[model samples]
Target chain A: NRQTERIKRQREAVPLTEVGSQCRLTFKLPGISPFDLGATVTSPGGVTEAAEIGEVEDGLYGVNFVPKELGVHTVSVKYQEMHIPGSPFQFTVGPLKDGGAHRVHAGGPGLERGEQGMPNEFNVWTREAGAGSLAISVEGPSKAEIDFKDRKDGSCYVSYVVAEPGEYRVGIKFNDKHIPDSPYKVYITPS
Target chain B: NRQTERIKRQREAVPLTEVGSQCRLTFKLPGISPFDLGATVTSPGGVTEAAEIGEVEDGLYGVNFVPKELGVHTVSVKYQEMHIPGSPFQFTVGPLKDGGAHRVHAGGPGLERGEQGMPNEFNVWTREAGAGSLAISVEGPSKAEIDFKDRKDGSCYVSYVVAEPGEYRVGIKFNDKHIPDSPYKVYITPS
Candidate 1:
């Protein structure tokens, strides 16, 4: 016999408290396995993104989303194509503390010169900076392949590869604010 | 000028989803250090306990609480003697799935016999059981000092020491439900 009560007993909604920080909600549905769960976050500007969902433990699941813009954000969690207890949770996002973005540091050989078609990497240290989101971008004569990796300790590694040789612009931002010496010009030589 | 806007911008409330499982809520408060933050949970039966609060990262904090009864639980979070955004959050707790308590297993000499004035230990495995609370107790001729350690992998180690004991009853329960052969008779002899 299917224990419907156990599966539908508890549903929790956790709203994001701050901008540029990952917000997570967790739920537990015992006696049920492989159940479909979905989550989405809609920004104040009407931008929506699918939330990342993963199992935290046996029968315990967590949904995560990060808010970029300030103001109220809406979170929707669904179970089997239907909204859970709190179909949509609304929460406000506020600005981060001052001087945090300025503390973010980025440096490496990749930010200055690199060979075309070769991977160039740079390291960003935000250990001293408060909790915030890190964004990186590269633009040049050719499309660049960029890979960003978070070290989970307030630091990140960013790598980019350009197909053509030329000057490229590397942009690094913390919490949407450009750090010092951002948009670095890198000369890529042909291989 | 200290960015007070960043420090007092956002606060979140995350209520417990179910009984017997750990419920954690995380928050990021930037620009503030050594600030007083407190949390407490009040059960339905008028029992209140302090919630565990810990730092997750730079200015990020997490509060954890576990509910033991099925009903609405009230959580109070205070910042400098004042309640943040939502002072007391009310959330409901529900029952866990059946047949989980029966899956808990216990064994070792600690459950059958032990030497007086010495430590006796036993292991309880609940890997297969759903998310629930584990409780243990030892009652005998004399007062016993109990030590419980959670392995964070659905198992626990329970140790007890008694002075001048003859017979002791060890009770092991999962979510208030006793597993098979609980309350085992443990005979203690002089060391």
Candidate 2:
């Protein structure tokens, strides 16, 4: 019994990220090479996503994740008949940070494109809480007083105004890092 | 194009009920034989229950529902590529009133089997608001003083004492009628 138990060593590690970012984790089953494994991700938004494990090489298998909510995400991976070591992995996600590029379009509520001289309102919701100074600029140089306010469920809204008749680049910064999608481009035509 | 869109006439009918009752609906897909239909019940409590259309006959299918809240429930039916007439049928549910029910049981906080000379409390919840006289009887005659009082969210508690004990057919009659599952039989043994 001891001899049979010595060969089953399961190991894995991976990173998790925000909505628009990608993350991948690999599991190594040394004894049993050239095989497929089962894996799934329970998302922060109460969604169960099953993974179709892809073979990176002979003894390595991997699954990818791009989470959609700002909550604790769980990942469960299984070996032949049982769970490998560290079967369930945990990861936390947050709003756009780390100099990332997240996109929220115009035409939504409060974020409509305004007339050239009128105020163009921009509103957005973050994955999690953490609102620093928001940077809103029309074309370049002309900036507006970006109001960062709280909404419900750890969500925030950033509103701004636009000058000139060009596209507006809206950005949200946290701890001096850009979130997943930053500096979003909003085109404003002459009204 | 005509062959695909032809002969897909779907029809359905079902009954929806209040909080503590059962409701069933059936769909009739006449003239079209050898096909499966898809049905789902979007409950009043923001829950979507998918149904496996049970074969009532050759071309008739059916589904069942027991709603849990006070709102409009929708049942959406589909056949292959199209939704049937009244594809999403709406049914409204409310609390039990005239024909509604009030239930009492012995398995809750402060309520247990009665001791020979001690008071046994019974806690219960109802289908809706509106309370009158609550009649409580133990066994055959030897009536127990039933004290019915309000709690929270349309629920109440009824406490009564049993001077003599045997098998207690505890009955609760509201407005001159037995609530849905009234007169719950509780066995009281020698303490």
Candidate 3:
């Protein structure tokens, strides 16, 4: 209620950084309120790290974090029982040098199917870095482009529309090395 | 965190349900504190639905929802700014006839590194119904047994011990159906 408007006014702006770089997010809350403020950075694999908050000045605070996981990391700023303005800020971790676990999110695919002969969307969250292009196949040629990015956390939202009703598989890799289970599947049906 | 322990005692013991089935999650949040006790159901494809909450009978509140996606959907209960006890409860969606996207979680392997030369663990979350067995292979021969099950949500945790230092690949199948990205990799190092 009042919290959203209050925090919305003083939302901090953080610059996007690489997976190994250090970054800071700044925000301000004018006036005084009885609220317990907390910040958490959730990695792609669902691991969360509490932030170290500092008073930049009176009624102002800044949170510092060293970017780790590639893809999208969620920076959530909570005031008492709710979020501060622009709370749950998304931080995207960029490219990496050494890639391994950062390349794969455990278990199944991030594929979403659409209605009969419609477009589809794919998502892949990897703890691995240096991920190469995403390849999709549905008995024929398929293409995808990065439509959305959670810069600090390394989440890539790929948008691809499929006209044919078929089962499509998507693959993720790092250089020549494929993530353990690269090809995730999307099964689409006719509308 | 005393609230966590307290509410945990009165946890509404919600039974996991099938996809598209109506389900209710109940919990005790005695007293009013200018807070909204709400619930959110998140689909595997990242869609979220806010719950319709009502006071089942004073001090006790329940949120009603129909499971949308197969696989594991998180039912998070929030009280004002924080989570009530057992808040982000994992609700699994089971039972499906057309099984495609329901077969696996995307990206890399569900394999995790373990203490070298010791037992290893694996987890796979699929929207697929009636998963059969997980077939695993490494540098050498190994056997695995399914350890955990969240029936409706299709989560299987497999346990196996490895005594060698090598990269092993794990394969998953439901009867004869192979998950799109089966044969995920697991790397082991000597301690």
Candidate 4:
């Protein structure tokens, strides 16, 4: 089929944050064209770092990284078309689940979106004592807040007190929101 | 200690459900004193005969099932205590997302629950198609109603609607509830 056109890349797995949370990672690109897209970020062992959130809205090209420490952080994104190449998504930033450190021994809220065999489970249960906190808030009413998940252990102090005096919409769901973890996962950390 | 407690009771694993919507499962036994902690529930593949749903006080116990088709819905619960004998808790609903005919590739209200996980995840999608015609009505005034878990897709009509009926407290995550899909599940059906 035209000699298989072109495709080769890896990047997808980011989440596990604490140190002022805001961890983000979103990726999507198609049909070569973006001045030859290229995004690379590595911190699993620390070395290569240079993929400042691929910026190219309309055409689609995303990259985001925010991590200084806790453990295991790897993000790799690549792009290029006509020259043919796109298949690099390795996102996994796991090394924080509130102070206790690692406690997801089964996994539920079950879901699998990238199955070759199967991998998408969560059951975290880490505890370090007290400082291992994670707090979120979205109080109520803002066109019907109804009710939304809100974690708390005192981390950005409830989004700095509910995004400036509560009411709702204060965020930070690690990995990149989507619940269950891994959206660039920042499992929740920083006491 | 007795061969590591028989290898921790054979590595424990069982949390299945899928019987036709209106699901149910709950068990709690604590502070062994005299023993008001007595309960029983077992289903290899046969339930929905009302399935418990009571014991609202001590040791706790609740059960509700609804998942007519799709497979692997084994749940077990037995209690005794004071020393341990009945102690058996197994669960394993099914893989009801798309494999089981349910629906909702996306839902309503700013996407049900969004802000991500670790606490922050609720989005009630319903691009509004047909079948039950489209649902999701969680009244407020701080009463309660639930149907989150992205509103499973396994073809269940989904009820608990009360436009101006009055009392209402519904719930529907995935599998059973006890916060199975936490966000604080509420159940009653109608006020």
Candidate 5:
């Protein structure tokens, strides 16, 4: 009876590794079919994709993916359309051991305090920083809309607005790594 | 000769614990004198105080501090005004067990995207969350100034600005604990 109950429980195995490398997660379900399990992976940039699943043996299953960004990645494994224990696992991908991210410099007037219902702007310079994908994220008490534009001369412009007054965090990432003093803190005040 | 070299190295002993509790750290210096060590502790709220240091034995010393906030604290132990190895240590204070932080809610346009050089604001409601100190932080590509005003009701207003285009991380803490979706991300674009 205990063995039968164990089959009803969800099982998973995952490991941490570096970026740009293939990652694999395994699962063991003695009595459950491999087809019953579904898996997906979400990158740090908020991109989600289905994970490659295959049967390793009689009841063991393996799911695989390649991480392209450095940060926290989420993996969700489900069984029978329901989440298994710890269905969503946070996987951290470290930067390459032999290489480092580029040095990105950012500053402007938008980084300071602003008035509510008004536009706050700033500039980002990627001239010195080598080639890499630039990712920007802004978080506040609520969902704040953002606008980004590339000057194409190794610099870019960004701006945003908040309906209420509160503190906001601005994240600037180059090649999936946070730039200097990134996730900068900006407080907005009442108009 | 090697033992003498060891004396030049910094020695430290620290442990993680809960808030509102006394913490102690012990250091061993076989060839150094205990009187040479000086220590200080910094709370999560940016308050720094001298740690109580006492000689436990001829070559052993102890440092003590009491944590009043729940979050990351810093400990700096110096000898002759020079930092020993790892002179500064990050200490984390976890919340007390058998208790949970009150639910805090935040919203408004300030949490949304804003224009350049304009104030972006948001609202934080703590009336239903119970009594606790509220801390707000806004970080962007640069140091953004913040303005906070208590409405005298159950809510407060916060505002900030960014000098450059980038993303920002807004941290809303209640009694050192992050509110739901805290460290909110808000993006700023060009005007």
Candidate 6:
């Protein structure tokens, strides 16, 4: 209970180079607490545990679990609740990449304000070997900028087709200011 | 680390029993070590966690975590990595009912089963969400049929909407499965 001050939800994701090129899932717990809340996750491989953790807020918990495998992933806030035990409302820690490249396409019709819309360029890709899929993503700054690969699934990860086979790329677009630059690549191979 | 065999990327979700309903998320782990790696999950807020660790398979492990919280709760999975410093994945969770619901109508242009002949009830259905959408699935023989509702990116959820509040019939016709006996209810107030 004395975990910390009022915790809030402020999180972001980053892919790790060595751990998993696909990246790292970091949860910025709103507050920091020493309650020692554990991680709970699901995958094709089935229910498993994640690795690494740190408290970023009074009660905020930060876990650096990588998507070493594929399939849809999810996270939730938990605690001991008897009858109605665990605290409810607002505790997320699920969904991630399995060292593969998932795609990044615009949500459609809404982002046409000269700043958003369909992913005119850039390509986000991934692949599968046996029971695993590899996702590689890249992106650019603006629609016209050069395209690249980037696994873009922050809220959720979608399982798509690998289509053809070959090599793949992953990265994001970077331009100084307006009309940013886009660069990326990703591919797959035979098992 | 005192954690059990961890699934690479996964999390648990809570289900509301309001409408004879329940929610769940699970994963599988491989290579059990001498140390007894254990897992403890929390619900969204008002649900029960099914105890009893899965039977130890041939060098494999399986566990299930349930969400007790409702709404947009956070579900995180944390554990100690085997050889490496820590676990490769650590992610936030997903949303439950009253969170995000996308409606999809099953039924589409029937395809000629005879390769351009009479149309058959091949099955009118909703498309899988996103590129790599994996629905909640189960295997083996039992007196039970499974209807997947775990929403993935761009996937679908059912939201009842109407011009006004009234009783309605929503037939969920599945090919000898859905039983189509009942459809969920939606009460819309006067706009």
Could you say which candidate leads in TM-score? 3
lDDT of each: 0.60, 0.45, 0.47, 0.29, 0.56, 0.26
TM-score of each: 0.27, 0.25, 0.28, 0.20, 0.25, 0.19
Q: What tens-digit string does per-residue lDDT give for candidate 1 at B156-191?
A: 545567777587778877667788788788899987
DockQ (0 to 1) for model 5: 0.02
* Local error of candidate 4 at residue A55 (angstroms): 13
lDDT of 4 by residue, B5-100 (tens): 000000001123444556544333322332333334444556523244466445434555554566444433334333222223333346423311
Worst 10 residues of 3 chain B by lDDT: B1-10
**Which of the two candidates, 4 or 6, achieves a greater TM-score against the reference?**
4
- Candidate 4 predicts chain B with a TM-score of 0.20
Candidate 2 lDDT at B27 equals: 45
Instruction: Give the 10-residue window scoring lowest on summed lDDT in candidate 4 chain B.
Output: B1-10
| Predictions' DockQ, in order | 0.01, 0.01, 0.01, 0.03, 0.02, 0.01
- Candidate 1: which pairs clash? none
Top model by lDDT, which number? 1
The residue-by-residue lDDT of candidate 2 on A65-157, one tens digit each, is: 777777667777776676654356554565333321132111222233445555444333232223232232334334332322222112233
Error of 1 at A2 (Å): 58
The parts of candidate 3 lying over 4 Å away from their true place are A1-191, B1-47, B50-97, B100-102, B106-110, B130-153
**Candidate 1 chain A weakest ten by summed lDDT:** A2-11
Question: Which of candidates 2 and 5 is the stronger one according to lDDT?
Answer: 5
Accuracy of chain B in candidate 1 (TM-score): 0.49
True-structure RMSD, every candidate: 26.3, 24.6, 25.0, 21.7, 23.7, 25.6
The Cα error of candidate 4 at residue A12, in Å, is: 18
Recovery fraction of native interface contacts for candidate 1: 0.00
Off by over 4 Å in 2: A1-191, B1-99, B102-112, B127-133, B140-143
How does candidate 2 score on lDDT? 0.45
